[PDB]
Amino acid sequence: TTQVTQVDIVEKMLAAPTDSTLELDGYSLNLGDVVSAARKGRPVRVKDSDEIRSKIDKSVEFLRSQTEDAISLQKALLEHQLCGVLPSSFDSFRLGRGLENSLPLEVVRGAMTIRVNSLTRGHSAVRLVVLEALTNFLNHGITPIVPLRGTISXDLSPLSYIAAAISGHPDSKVHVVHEGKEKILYAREAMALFNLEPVVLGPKEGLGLVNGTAVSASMATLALHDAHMLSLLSQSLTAMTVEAMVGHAGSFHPFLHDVTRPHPTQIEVAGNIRKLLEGSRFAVHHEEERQDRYPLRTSPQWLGPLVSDLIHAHAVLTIEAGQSTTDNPLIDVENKTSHHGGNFQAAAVANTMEKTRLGLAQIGKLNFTQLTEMLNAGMNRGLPSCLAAEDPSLSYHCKGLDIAAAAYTSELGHLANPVTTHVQPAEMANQAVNSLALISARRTTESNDVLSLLLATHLYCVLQAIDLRAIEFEFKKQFGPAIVSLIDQHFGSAMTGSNLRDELVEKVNKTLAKRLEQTNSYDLVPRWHDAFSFAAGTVVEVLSSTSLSLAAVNAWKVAAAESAISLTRQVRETFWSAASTSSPALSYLSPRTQILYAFVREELGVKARRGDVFLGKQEVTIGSNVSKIYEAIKSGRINNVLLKMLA
Template sequence: MSRLSSTPSPRRHLDVVQVHWRELIDYRTNSRVPVVDGRTFSVAAVAAVSRFRIVPELTTAEDILAKVDAAATIVAQFVAQSALSGAGSMYGTTTGFGGSVPKLQRVLIQGLQAGITLPPPRQESEGDGVPLAVGIRLITPEEWVKAIRMNSLVRGHSGVRLSVIESLGQLLKENIIPCPPLRQTISASGDLGPLAYIAGALTGDNHCLVWDGEGSSRALTTAPLALSRRSLTPLELLPKEGLAIVNGTAPSCAVAACTLHDAHFLLLLSQATTAMSVEVLLGTAESFTPFISEVARPHPGQVEVSMNIRNALSGSKLVQSYDERNATERLRQDRYSLRTAPQWLGPQVEELLSAHHTITIEINSTTDNPIIDVSKGERGNISGGNFQGTSLTVAMEKVRIGLQHVGRIAYAQLVELGSPSMNRGLAPDLAANEPSFDYGQKALDMACAAYLAELSFVANTVSNHVQPAEMHNQSVNSLAMISARYTATAVQLVQMILSNLLLSVCQASDLRAMYAAFFVKLGDNLHDTLSATITPPLPPPEMDRLCAILADQVKASFGETSWLDTKDRFHTMCKPLLADVHTFLVAQALSDMYSFNGHAFHTTLAASLAAAWISNRDTYFRDGSAEELLGHGTQKLYRWVRRGLGLSMRRGIDIDRGTIDLDVSKIYEGIVNGDVNDVLVDVFGGIEMSQ
């Protein structure tokens, strides 16, 4: 039994991501090499080969290589016997293909090269390749072409010689990457079109374009020229080998694996930004208590998301706690984007785990046709439909719909952060300076609306748009590559949305920290102003009680006047305090004993608080940080943005050196490149399930 089927899967998404990430790090640090053995290749191995130019090693296991040789021998013997006797037929070896004419192997490969692509370079000489930037929209990205076809063929079910598999590995080693058209395949008899261009690179097809060269000199050229530059001989394919190469789901599977790699970390990032949103919106951790998800409704994904957010918030000084036994308090439920995050994201966790399992199986499967069971000898040639990529299509649709859910909740959180009616006292548009001159959040909101609209469109299912093809021979076809490509688009859009949200929650975190620093000194301003405007001075107990009452009112009014600039804000927010002072003096039967100069109190306190606010703001702009207010998990993500990427809070157009687009693009780059992945694993790492 293979390792894939005998090893139990980790029960949590976090476990799967941690194992996946550690494996990928091992490959990138050369402490481990992906082995092409048809059994144990993983999503991490695909990511390593596709994105980080890790060259896999072909297995040396004798039982595996022996099966490859045995299958090739069966094909060769059948062809030889058929030639002598004139009897017998083997599909794709001595027969035609579907409705096509019976001119085999090389004719098959060239006949399938029918996509819209770029013309070959005009001159076949060094340096005459097409520049990198030309025609990118027409051809498949390099990372989607690598890694998996070798792993399928080495299973010994395809009848190809070992030299064919070794030649594919040599292309990877020399960094000669074929360039199939981006669109052509319906993923029914596998990805015939893309794989035909890969086969054309092996055989030195003069019309087959490949990437060749290194660094800035890397360019498109023809397969013969690239092979000759590396002293490689074009491969001569024997019977069945052309069909074996072009018949399979490898390209769709490569795209699916790369896309799934990204989706895993986007789901973790969504949980981290949700936790930060809870903090900066002064939400409660009550929504994530174990009883709600682990006892009352124990869906595995919901349980995990609840646990992750709860643990990321541990130690936070911003999260609120409400006690219904206290008569002065009432239950304050957070908005749905916070309160129902486990119920919203939890099902997506489960679907990603399902997709991971499906894609891992597909990576280590035989997907061409016919296939050979070497244990049955001459009778082992079996025709079927393993090339149909529907498993990938459905897995990618699960992932794509899940990504739309991630984008939707992130946009809801972004809108609530910037809206004074919903953000519990934050400045409109998260303005750190004067609101009338700082509304950059509006632009982030509008951009995210565009991203989410497109995301919601591409999240629609592809599989219900199947068209019969190839003279109705391929009457049902999976469209797996199309589904995977749209999922890759969904990944990019979610990366953009979460970049905007992460920039925003860090801005909001700094605002909360800046407000908190201001409130610390609030008591002194109140005490000094009351002492100067109430005669004789109130005794310390009464003064302390009055200051506490006014401080609570100032904090509330501070949030309610966040839309005003400083010159108007403190005058407006201090005016209601006059009534509070009078009410206190009357309630304490002190109004006849003390004189209160209300006008002086109002003007003095407003001026004092305005000056203190400006001083506090300037100080925070110089060296403030929100780290100490955040949870043990969320502060790591904040630290990555502020220290790792070097992005300061948005302070105003007259102060900031950078611009919003440059800042959010830097976060986006860090997400796309995977720089944030270590941070995310650290944010949630080592967390045990609650008992």
């Protein structure tokens, strides 16, 4: 639909407050909201309504009227569910290790937020003091430690650990930061510290808690949120690769989408890239009288299908996470009746994770092909061998990254296979079909991580590639006239009263380019002597009817190259002398892509790399720098940059 783009969605999510308290009313909770609560420690509370309180209280009352095994049964439903694996002791912990078998804290916080929001719909019949137990945990930084695996997503077990924690189970353990450091204390031990009192689960109040898809919906919401970002970064990387490659903006022309193949997201993607490329002095906007490969040229038709899936996933997950009661059985109250269904079958969130993971693998394949092309000397239209600043003979700057990019891409491929086709006949066959939503959600989450390493690698590389390209442009700017000059100083007199000027200038220059594009692997000196050497053979053809010794041309050849090698060395020192805030790239880069350049180059401190050898020094590794770009993506810091350049 040409109304609501991924960007609209990202801006909405990014607008979510982290300070103001989030109010759960059972219907307006959105994806940006759950993410702010899970990761940004946003305060959370069941909306101060009365309507909400009444329907809640009414649900409970309707049940009270239909005291013994009611509580006992709950204990029996919680017992068999606390069956997951977790480190038995703290002795197993090690530096940077220890909690691998536990669900990420943000997933648990997001799960509790979604758990409460749905219980406010007055269908579950669980006391308001129980929902409050959960919001207090969230507001006091108390997060239950729950096993990573064990659920088939009909999320009974992980949810039970949450219930056990609030109900103060003896073996229940929780996580919490106690001024300065983080600790893992027992449930009743943590609650004691914050003056919180353990709740006591009553009639059917246990199924109303352990039933549901809150844990899946939570991790899935975190994953879709991260994937949107990666999607927009991919598009930004495309625009910047079009620039570094000196490609064509025309592939993103409205006629090639809006008109001829009106897929709303093909239009959306082409529109975004078109926008990013506007005002670019790197990319080509017109031609007068040429190829440009699929990685760049077919990028909208490649990413477009993926984007609609991500937009679709967003529709599904906002309904799932903010407007659905996934418990069972459910009460109708106003109609005085209980219904037995299966709203706990998280096939909806599983379906979004399966589709997103395949999409994450398609985005990675696209960007990999663009990046590997740009890193291929015989394909990147002139750029230095491995994006090395100095002589390639002792510099292979990005070769390893080119390799790492393939490694990430391969892994995304395997990760992309479906999880939902591996359903087993669980629970004495009563749960013969289960969604496997959290397992799918977990796989998609790893794919986000792997794509992030790939895209952080691509960003690092294009930056370096456009700086180099900026250097080529600075050089060309001055060498263009210099060629004309050194020509006349050596041939003007050699032949006057002829047309041996406008022609020799046009053919020499046309021959120089032709050869220099497939000689970008040569070290500086040999490259230029090779260039004009070929250029000489061109003068011999235009100036056939002229009086000149072969030593009178060989002098023009050694002088032309000499100037080129001296020029190039000049432009280079100028660049490495000026701070990045003054980079020559900032005068060719589009105003919008210039925003990401500055973010990485200025705010993240990762600069262009000269080359250990040349510098005669081993500087902070490339990896240490890629790692910094990677971390900006995982923390989300880059999100606003992306929004700002695409808004």
